[model samples]
Target: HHHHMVDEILKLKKEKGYIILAHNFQIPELQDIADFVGDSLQLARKAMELSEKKILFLGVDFMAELVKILNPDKKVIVPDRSATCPMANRLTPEIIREYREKFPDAPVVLYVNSTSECKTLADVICTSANAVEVVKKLDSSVVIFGPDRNLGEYVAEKTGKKVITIPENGHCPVHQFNAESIDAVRKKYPDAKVIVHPECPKPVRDKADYVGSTGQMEKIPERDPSRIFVIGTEIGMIHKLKKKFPDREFVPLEMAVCVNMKKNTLENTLHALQTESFEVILPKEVIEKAKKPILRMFELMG
Candidate 1:
């Protein structure tokens, strides 16, 4: 209900030697209480720095899996296992198995917005911030991209290497919702620059004066200073942008907040630490399979 809930979680977490991590999309109070807070991959990597062997993940399911995969020794807890990404779930194991049988020669490159199952199947993984660079680095002429089509399209377009996309549909509600509703915001602020995420639908990304991941969006608004800009992403991101560049005004083009993401509120943090009600457990073999692709992600991106 208030910041006091976070205070309690922090206290309880300390008692259990637990490290709390919040994504940039998490609410401000939760982010404030977190030991680490950033983009999905960054937050996952941040867990490696912790001396504590327990992690209380304050994000979606895949994010918790990422930390568990990286630090199998650590216990990772996702408050709600159902707090999953629809886009991540779009491409199932069946799709990959079918693709592998059809095109044995082609390699699969996965986006981080996917499940542990997909990560195991993928040869390499990428984030929106580095997807283009990763795809370009691939030596293969034929590659399969999955889960998020917008991101895949963006990568393919940038690399000029058309990818074999598995037929599946998954989308970001906030990104898609804004592309349709943003006309009014643009109309209202004619002078405003539109900064959006590549996960946004083509039309919305097309409308954007700037397009990038959450980390990149933080940089885009800084370059267009001394003017107002409309940000077509999650509302939680406004905290980073506003804190980064106080001179510029960033407005949300749509009331975009992923409810599942928002579900990680003050109450959950309190209860999670109090009872450890929502605990994430992963097998060692799953972590081993997950790590190969993640390490491939860094190598491919590098």
Candidate 2:
């Protein structure tokens, strides 16, 4: 079965001295085989701490590129170079320029999900984990944010700032869970605490008891002793939560999937390790420019 493929992947990974990093949205099988599985930015930051110089990144294009940008000296390869985030691609450098021209007073706080070129123009960068905190620390009362309208609105709500999302309707298709699903889950599992991602529409986000990033969602059960929890992100994340807190129950708010995340199968992962042909290579200028805003995020956080 696929177990042989997994075994071979592990064998070659160790033989070639590669560290396997998986995003939380990756399939459970790939997550099981990864050295570390976490959020995109978290996993990218993790590569900096690792001694291994080679990485087999299991996620979409932007995430892999972030890892490569941070560890420019290291070798980074992905199972499928074509796997990419649809929302991230929507925001372009031109859009950022237009928005910046319109809101000269507002700082452009680009999301980590954006393209590397877009990052170069950001006043600061943030992930779902730190968007609010980063924005709150900014000197300006208003900020330009984008690539996900829902997340921008969520930040605006939390920070009480004017969030100007660059692309008109930028959003993650995966987090478009209906508010009806929340209502239905309430009736079916009344005792369950409903947790949702901020990327969800206002209706869904407003209805949920808790809204957080995947990293934050993983830590909720420890403090809140919920026997059952309805998760509102991609289906693959449920597997990660289940593995961490097996004693508790985890159900999707709605059955959702990310096609790009699912592209990295055990087969391609093994092939990536065996061949190591697709390396994540970014331009020197792009890396240097993109790193600035990301570093600013850390500075603001501190």
Candidate 3:
């Protein structure tokens, strides 16, 4: 039954010229069927590069909104409307306003994990992959980075710049893993190397053999084959990793899962393509306002 449904989804997707984009945090089943799968920035770029007229994004609300922002002319839809980033909600417009007033001299940088509303308020947008580079290149000696304090702190350490993180209360719930999560796995697979996301708490990242974004994580097996890896990010990544390197053992540390990313099931994806429900229609001002900082990120990273 599942296979039949997936086949139907694939058929309809092709019939309607719809592109399916899934984030790394999505379930394995959804990830397998997606036309393109990667980190948020990669997905956004793919959606823009592809010629597909419609897109069914199988990820959180903020990601779909980003895709819509990047491709305003295309029809973008989210499989589940409630699939939203908790960290994105943590930093509100009021909090951003306060940060702006407090750090008038500091340039504002937002993690792409934030909402469209939040991105519009930022001077530049960044992802974990390019946060340090982005912070370093900014003309300011100091910068305000947020919505994810862990990422902000990580960037601060890497760039040696004064990073004034916002809200002091924001974090990625899934990335709050500690050293304890990897200790047991390390002992069991004594030869396994532990790689973690920068969004992880300082302790967790400190203990890691490697620290990088999901895009970087995907590149590890290619560089070194035949090594067992305990990936310290969301479990959805294990699916792709395992598929790529069947010989290497790819383990998820402590079953880290994002409920928001999981909210998008294959069932809803089929329905979304069929009915076009849960369309992500951002305000024109919001898209135009948000595009500048995001585009600036691309230009700066280049």
Candidate 4:
């Protein structure tokens, strides 16, 4: 049954020239079938680099919007329209505007986990992969960061910049792991290297042998000599790690799952390709406005 669905989806993909982009946090089934899979920034860059006329993004709505933001001429769609990031919702345009008004001198650095509306208001956009570099190179002594206070604080600590986080209310629910949980994992797998994402609590991140983005996490095991790893991000990441390094053992710090990311299924992916139900459309103004920060990030990265 699964094979038939996957076969049909692949045929549809080739026939329609629909390139699929799955996030690292998506289910293993979707990740396996996807044309490409990576963290948000990687997927966004892939969306830009692809020549395909349409993109089927198998992640949350914000990810689809990012594809649309970068490739305005390309058709972008998501399998499930309801797969939205709650953390992204926490930073509404109203809140960003209010913060901008209060801190007129401070440039706004928006995490990639934001809505197109919020992105337009930001001076720069950053992902976990490049947050430290972005924060360090920004031409401001103080910056307004949001919507994840944890990441903001992490970046601030690394860069020695004053980050004024908005409302101090935004986090990846999956990454809300406790430090004690990590300590327990360490005791169990004393030989395993602890790798974590910056979105985790400060204590958890501080204890990590390595703190990085999903992209960085994917490669950490390969570069390191260690054979056992305690992955501290989403549960789905362990799937890829295990598949990539079958000889190496990968353990989850916690079975952290993103409900929103798991919403896309093989059934919905097929239906989305067939019906094009949930197309990600953005206004020209929003796309143009939002793209500035993203482009700035690319420049800074270079």
Best by lDDT: 2
Each candidate structure's count of clashing pairs = 0, 0, 0, 0
What TM-scores do the predictions have? 0.92, 0.99, 0.97, 0.97
Question: Candidate 4 on 1-302: residue-level lDDT in tens?
Answer: 99999999999999888998998888899889998989877888888778788998988888889988888999888888999999988898898888889989998999999988999988999998898899899889899999899999998899999989875677878899989988898788888899999999899999999999988988887689797999899999988888778999988998888889888899999999889768899999999999999999999999
Extract clashing residue pairs from model 3: none
lDDT of 3: 0.89
Q: Tell me, what's the RMSD of every candidate?
A: 1.9, 0.7, 1.1, 1.1
lDDT tens readout by residue for model 2, 194-283: 999999999999999999999999999999999999999999989999999999999998889999999999988988998995899999
List per-prediction Cα lDDT, in the order shown.
0.81, 0.94, 0.89, 0.89
**TM match of model 4 to true structure:** 0.97
Which order, best to worst by lDDT?
A: 2, 3, 4, 1
The total number of steric clashes, by the backbone 3 Å criterion, in model 4 comes to: 0
| lDDT at residue 243 of model 2 (Cα atoms) | 97
Total colliding residue pairs, candidate 1:
0
Report lDDT (Cα) of residue 76, candidate 2.
96
Worst 10 residues of 1 by lDDT: 173-182
Kindly report which residue pairs in candidate 4 clash with one another.
none
RMSD of 2: 0.7
Q: Best candidate per TM-score, number?
A: 2
The digit string of per-residue lDDT tens for model 3 on 1-302 reads 88987999999989988888999888888988999989988998988788777998998998989999989999998878999988888888898899899889898899998989989999999999999999999999899988888999999898899988886868989988879978887789888889999989999999888999999998887886647999989999999888778888888877888988988888888888889777899999999999999989999988
